[PDB]
Design a protein around this nucleic acid. Structure first.
Ligand SMILES: [Mg+2]
Ligand SMILES: [Zn+2]
Lengths: 79, 86, 167, 148, 225, 51, 86, 151, 218, 220
RNA sequence: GAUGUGUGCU
């Protein structure tokens, strides 16, 4: 459940980068196979992503680090 | 309630704000000092008259009523050739 | 700047005699008088913004070590950056006299012939743009809407900055 | 005379009676004005004004949705609503309002397929009404073109 | 009628013409839902061809705004009328007296914010009593033009349709007068030599009350026509 | 009151407080029957004399 | 895909460069079997095919011929959307 | 054919998907705000009372226009930028724009007001809850003058 | 606590009556009175005309040579018919009538398991010496208001909006009772006004049955 | 036509005990308010219990006075006693005493037991003292009654609040069965004074309401 | 589809 995005804006302090970060994360959960980092309560992908940004455990740096790590992992498994 | 976020259209939220109240606007002596305090004359150019009081000889003169603290509380415009009471 | 007659001043005399802060103070206090009379609250940031956009051109007084004409009405930002790179060297810059144009002449006289052409007087703008062989860099909010890409204002700001730093 | 006529009935001359709440059964703690007003039913019906559209037919020369309710047409995101989306900063809502659900014919069907494929992502192009403008300017004696 | 009028209703609703007003006084001789017959007082009959005068009321017919203009008699059998007094009421008049709406019992009070700005909170008895129910007729058209590859006829032979579609059309192809149709149903069957049948627009219900065919000359007829 | 809730307690308490104000003003405005009649526009006893 | 828009006058050679043909007869669709004329303000030869992936004379009807200019009327079998670009 | 299953499927494609609600002259930017939909029986777009001020919308017959943000960034913009919750100050001045008006204030005024006599004008209550328990029972007048014990 | 009991049913008219419940503890007059008022106004079981078949009539926007009323006005007068079918919950009355004069409800050839409670109820006026209506009025039992445009075939059957509800007005009053040595005991006078097709005592007993059956959740 | 949507308690969501919040759905159309308001009117003002009816303090004989060394005023000690939620066994009325002295708070755990008379809140504060010589003592007569009985109607008198429900407030909202357009959904939010649990006082109120509808129920 | 006219609504 989500009504106000004030906490998520305090975490990613721009509200215009909040949109882009949460959109990246939600398209991960939706198109990609990645699963939520927080127990979904029958929320859509956007609200799950916003709720993750609020609980602290995702932002632009975290997303980029995960992406680079998993790219390197896939390349290593490629042999 | 914070400083403006880098990268956001202020030229549009400025014109919208100056133009939304457009539908609310229409389309179609002596100096009575009011409160307690001192008096200051901005750009004084005056001379004492034979009546004992002062007459001002500069059009840009302003009469400021200052509160006892030191802040300006009133401001009037005094014409050319106006006799003061104090 | 002191009065040699009486009457209401035109905010070009205020501009060129009493300065730029004098004319912003004038325009702000006047339009705010008009609003405040009807009990409308509008912060002054907005009127200072529109005033800033009314002071964009600048006539040249003397060229100096620069390459502008004498009475050419160049934009103020071009003058500012050119002189700031000349004083970075040893040369001597150019002296300018701020202009002040209404919101209808400061829009037709901007640097993109697509903004202007989509605002007003389309034929009068496409003619001068055609003979001057002009060139539009696609940089405001209206040209990116006309064309159809992201405006460079909100999230399009991040996008456009990435795209610009890619060149 | 109105009060005399109320007395000729047996109603309170103040025109106000004491109403009870229908669903909690207690008084409105004031006498309220009850009477008989002659009401009219203006013919601005609502089932003559409710309209919705996801996809329909699109115009011919400028490939935009058609207008009005008879033609299964779409609302006009006017010129003044663009400024309200620019003000908010919503640069993606605006792009999809003037590209995907509107002119750009090649990236307008890719969006239909993406949407009924589980994907929500736009491959936007150039509004086919800008090319109409380029052709109508280039059909004056004016060479207008795109650089690189 | 309005309980609180102005007295200018019996003029506005008589001088506008919707109502069927007596021409010569007399006694009502026969009153039907769709005609009145006045036997004129002999004090007002001409020397020759004394007779009576007949008023054919305008039954359910369509106004420009797609509403029902429909006269109904306000007199009864065997009852005297004098000159210039209404015999039949028009649309939105009551006993020859303008009546645009209904008299409903209002209470001026806030009610849980359902009449917040200018809104109105109507009871359910106002819609049970069917008192603001209005009637609205609408004509749909279907023209048979002689295109290329040969003209287009109105036959019922429609390809690529279920039988539920052709169930309401008669043999001639046009719908049955009285068929409760809904959105999408076939009203007229028209064929394109390669199908441009006339169908009910989306979401508009109805009951077909009048089918109406025109034909130029040399085109023989159809039994329906 | 709303403008001071916003500045002391932030945005979420104010968005929850605005709906509460709404429901509880609606309830107690309906519950009062605060109508309007003709005997409420009371003409002064001194209007005839002044005029 | 593109980063600027340049406007200028148009030289007669450039106007010939844009054009895909020449228009010499002031006659639109022939008010008959509705096919564009030879060299009128509509023309299948100059501007493009009227029906998608079909010549005008009726010698080709499929995509497999895409790109071949017909011989009877010179209407290169191609999309019909090129009548809004040529 | 609107089977009974293209509902809650629909009540789920609607769950947390905002829709924009625009009113005809969009004079300022508060004239487009994104609300979360609640499916209602009818043909009228029910519109919360506290946003009417911003919209400049009475209910004497004016119409609104719903738009649907399709893509994913458009939903996060309609939620993080345009959501009618995020707009409780006006961009034209630091003044509020969610201001209760005209019935929420006649109610809050009739309630919070005193009459110099009432059903119970002396009694010393023991908290707000007892005040409600007394008003609802008809033992005290909403305008009484009591001594409450509040924390 | 004490308990209320139906001590008096003063049937003042054929339609409206007054039941009385006493004794009622303090503060219960209003509880029971308003629960019963809302349940009577909302959920009582009635019968209503639902489909009509007039002989030579195809749609309701037409007229019949001989009758003084459109078929729409006939449909409204039927929609206001008060009938009390007794055993079934769907019956078909058959009205046959010919000759000048009104057509009251008495001209319905009704069965044993049907009771027309208001026989003076006009339906339509025949104004010709040889004009005759023959209609088949289909009455059935239900609840609440169920319009013709919400239910669920030939081009004869006309549909009327059915208002299956016998009570028209319910009022209730609470006033102190005379118990030999006790005060603060109330008495509830439920002054109801049906249309005739239900019994006051049975109305109150159905209301209380519905209320208690809803309370049976706990 | 006699079958109604019979509801069932969807959930009994309980905030800190004695603050439960029941929701029952899908209740028939318009039954939200009949049921909610019947239960509210019963729970609020017609429901049995014990409460401190009156009290006499040794060294004061008038509501507007002050016993020396006691922090509160007698006008506030009477308030602190009004909230004393107490359960009494088969006796109809009993008397308790509050002999105590010493600097500190006087809490309900300082009353003489009296056997079966049980105090639900031993942490309830009654008065504060300020001297090692300050000694307070009072005889509180607690009594059984129905509902709420003020003192203006009736040796300092205390407004006797006999019933347990501190605050009941239902709120009906819209809910839908598979297709039926708009039904009700009763949402009751009850607090009690600890002497009874909410999900039990709701059942006691429903029992009270049902027993009234037994002389004229159809037994169907 | 374009244009015009008219009405109406904000
Ligand atoms: Mg309006
Ligand atoms: Zn060919």
């Amino acid at each position: 459940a989500r009504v106000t995005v004030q906490d998520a804006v305090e975490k990613i302090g721009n509200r215009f980068d909040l949109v882009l970060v949460a959109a990246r994360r939600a398209r991960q959960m939706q198109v990609g196979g990645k699963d939520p980092l927080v127990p979904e309560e029958n929320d859509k992908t956007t609200v799950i992503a916003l709720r993750e940004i609020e609980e602290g455990l995702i932002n632009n740096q975290i997303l980029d680090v995960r992406e680079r790590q998993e790219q390197q992992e896939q390349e290593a498994a490629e042999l | 309630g914070h400083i403006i976020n880098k990268g956001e259209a202020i030229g549009v939220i400025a014109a919208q704000s100056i133009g939304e109240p457009g539908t609310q606007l229409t389309m179609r002596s002596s100096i009575q000092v009011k409160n307690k305090g001192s008096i200051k004359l901005s750009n004084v150019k005056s001379v004492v008259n034979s009546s004992g009081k002062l007459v001002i000889t500069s059009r840009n003169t302003e009469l400021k009523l200052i509160d006892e603290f030191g802040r300006t509380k009133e401001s009037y415009k005094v014409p050319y050739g106006a006799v003061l009471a104090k | 700047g002191d009065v040699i007659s009486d009457g209401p001043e035109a905010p070009h005399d205020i501009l060129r005699l009493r300065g730029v802060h004098a004319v912003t103070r004038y325009i702000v206090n006047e339009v705010q008088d008009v609003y405040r009379l009807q009990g409308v609250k509008i912060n002054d940031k907005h009127i200072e913004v529109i005033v800033r956009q009314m002071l964009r051109k600048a006539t040249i007084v003397n060229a100096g070590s620069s390459d502008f004409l004498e009475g050419e009405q160049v934009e103020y930002s071009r003058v500012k950056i050119a002189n700031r790179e000349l004083e970075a060297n040893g040369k001597v810059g150019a002296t300018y006299s701020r202009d002040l144009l209404g919101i209808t002449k400061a829009s037709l006289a901007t640097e993109s012939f697509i903004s202007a052409a989509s605002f007003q007087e389309t034929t009068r703008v496409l003619t001068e743009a055609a003979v001057a062989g002009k060139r539009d860099e696609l940089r405001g909010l209206k040209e990116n809407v006309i064309v159809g890409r992201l405006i460079p204002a909100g999230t399009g700001y991040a996008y456009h900055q990435d795209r610009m730093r890619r060149r | 005379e109105i009060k005399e006529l109320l007395k000729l009935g047996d109603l309170p001359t103040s025109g106000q009676i004491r109403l009870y709440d229908g669903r909690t059964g207690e008084q409105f703690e004031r006498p309220v004005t009850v009477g008989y007003m002659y009401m009219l039913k203006l013919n601005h019906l609502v089932d003559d004004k409710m309209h919705a559209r996801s996809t329909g037919s699109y115009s011919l020369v400028t490939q935009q949705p058609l207008g009005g309710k008879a033609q299964f047409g779409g609302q006009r995101f006017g010129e003044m609503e663009v400024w309200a989306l620019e003000a908010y900063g919503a640069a993606y809502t605006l792009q999809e309002m003037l590209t995907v659900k509107s002119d750009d014919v090649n990236g307008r069907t890719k969006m239909y397929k993406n949407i009924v494929d589980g994907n929500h992502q736009m491959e936007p192009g150039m509004p086919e009404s800008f090319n109409v403008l380029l052709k109508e300017i280039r059909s004056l004696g004016i060479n207008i073109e795109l650089e690189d | 009628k309005p309980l609180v009028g102005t007295g200018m209703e019996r003029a506005v609703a008589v001088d506008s013409g919707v109502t069927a007003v007596a021409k010569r006084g007399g006694v009502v001789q026969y009153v039907d839902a769709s005609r009145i017959v006045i036997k004129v007082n002999e004090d007002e009959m001409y020397p020759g061809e004394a007779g009576i005068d007949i008023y054919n009321l305008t039954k359910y017919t369509r106004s420009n705004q797609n509403t029902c203009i429909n006269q109904m008699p306000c007199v009864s059998l065997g009852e005297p009328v004098e000159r210039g007094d209404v015999l039949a009421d028009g649309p939105s008049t009551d006993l020859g007296e303008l009546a645009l709406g209904q008299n409903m019992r209002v209470a001026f009070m806030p009610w849980n914010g359902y009449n917040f700005e200018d809104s109105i909170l109507v009871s359910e008895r106002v819609v049970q009593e069917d008192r603001f129910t209005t009637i609205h007729i609408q004509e749909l058209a279907c023209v048979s033009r002689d295109t290329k590859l040969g003209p287009e006829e109105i036959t019922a032979d429609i390809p690529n349709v279920g039988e539920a579609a052709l169930s309401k059309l008669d043999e001639s192809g046009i719908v049955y007068i009285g068929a409760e149709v809904t959105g999408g149903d076939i009203l007229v069957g028209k064929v394109t030599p390669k199908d441009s049948s006339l169908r009910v627009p989306n979401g508009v219900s109805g009951t077909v009350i009048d089918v109406q065919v025109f034909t130029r000359d040399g085109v023989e007829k159809d039994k329906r026509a | 009151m709303l403008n001071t809730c916003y500045r002391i307690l932030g945005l979420k308490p104010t968005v929850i407080f605005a709906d509460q104000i709404m429901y509880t003003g609606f309830a107690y405005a309906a519950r009062s029957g605060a109508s309007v009649g003709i005997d409420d526009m009371v003409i002064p006893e001194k209007k005839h004399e002044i005029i | 895909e593109f980063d600027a828009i340049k406007i200028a006058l148009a030289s007669p050679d450039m106007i010939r460069s844009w054009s895909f043909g020449e228009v010499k007869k002031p006659e639109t669709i022939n008010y008959r079997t509705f096919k564009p004329e030879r060299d009128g303000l509509f023309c299948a030869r100059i501007f493009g095919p009227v029906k998608d992936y079909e010549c005008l004379c009726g010698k080709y009807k499929r995509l497999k011929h895409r790109g071949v200019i017909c011989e009877k009327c010179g209407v290169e079998v191609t999309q019909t959307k090129v009548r809004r670009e040529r | 054919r609107e089977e009974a299953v293209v509902w809650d499927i629909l009540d789920e494609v609607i769950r947390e998907h905002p829709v924009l609600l625009n009113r005809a002259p969009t004079l300022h930017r508060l004239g487009i705000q994104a609300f979360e939909p609640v499916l209602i029986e009818g043909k009228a777009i029910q519109l919360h009372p506290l946003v009417c001020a911003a919209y400049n919308a009475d209910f004497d017959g004016d119409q609104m226009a719903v738009h649907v943000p399709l893509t994913l960034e458009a939903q996060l913009e309609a939620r993080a930028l345009m959501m009618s919750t995020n707009n409780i100050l006006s961009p034209a001045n630091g003044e509020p724009i969610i201001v209760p008006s005209q019935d929420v204030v006649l109610g809050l005024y009739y309630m919070t007001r005193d009459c110099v006599n009432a059903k119970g004008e002396g009694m010393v209550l023991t908290g707000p809850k007892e005040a409600e328990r007394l008003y609802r029972s008809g033992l005290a007048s909403l305008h009484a003058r009591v001594k409450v014990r509040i924390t | 606590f004490l308990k209320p009991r139906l001590v008096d049913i003063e049937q003042v008219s054929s339609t409206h009556a007054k039941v009385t419940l006493e004794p009622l503890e303090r503060g219960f007059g209003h509880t029971l009175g308003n629960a019963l008022r809302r349940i009577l106004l909302s959920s009582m079981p009635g019968c209503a005309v639902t489909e009509v078949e007039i002989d030579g009539v195809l749609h309701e926007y037409s007229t019949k040579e001989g009758v003084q009323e459109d078929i729409l006005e006939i449909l409204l007068n039927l929609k206001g018919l008060a009938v009390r079918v007794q055993g079934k919950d769907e019956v078909i009355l058959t009205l046959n009538k010919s000759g000048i004069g009104p057509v009251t409800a008495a001209d319905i050839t009704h069965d044993g398991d049907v009771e027309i409670v208001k026989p003076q109820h006009v339906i339509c006026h025949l104004t010709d010496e040889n004009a005759s209506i023959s209609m088949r009025i289909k009455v059935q039992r239900g609840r609440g208001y169920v319009p013709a445009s919400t239910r669920i075939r030939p081009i004869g059957r006309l549909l009327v909006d059915a208002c299956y509800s016998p009570v028209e007005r319910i009022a209730y009053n609470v006033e102190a009772a005379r118990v030999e040595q006790r005060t603060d005991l109330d008495k509830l006078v439920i002054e109801m006004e049906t249309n005739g097709t239900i019994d006051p005592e049975e109305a109150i007993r159905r209301a209380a049955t519905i209320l208690a059956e809803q309370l049976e959740a706990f």
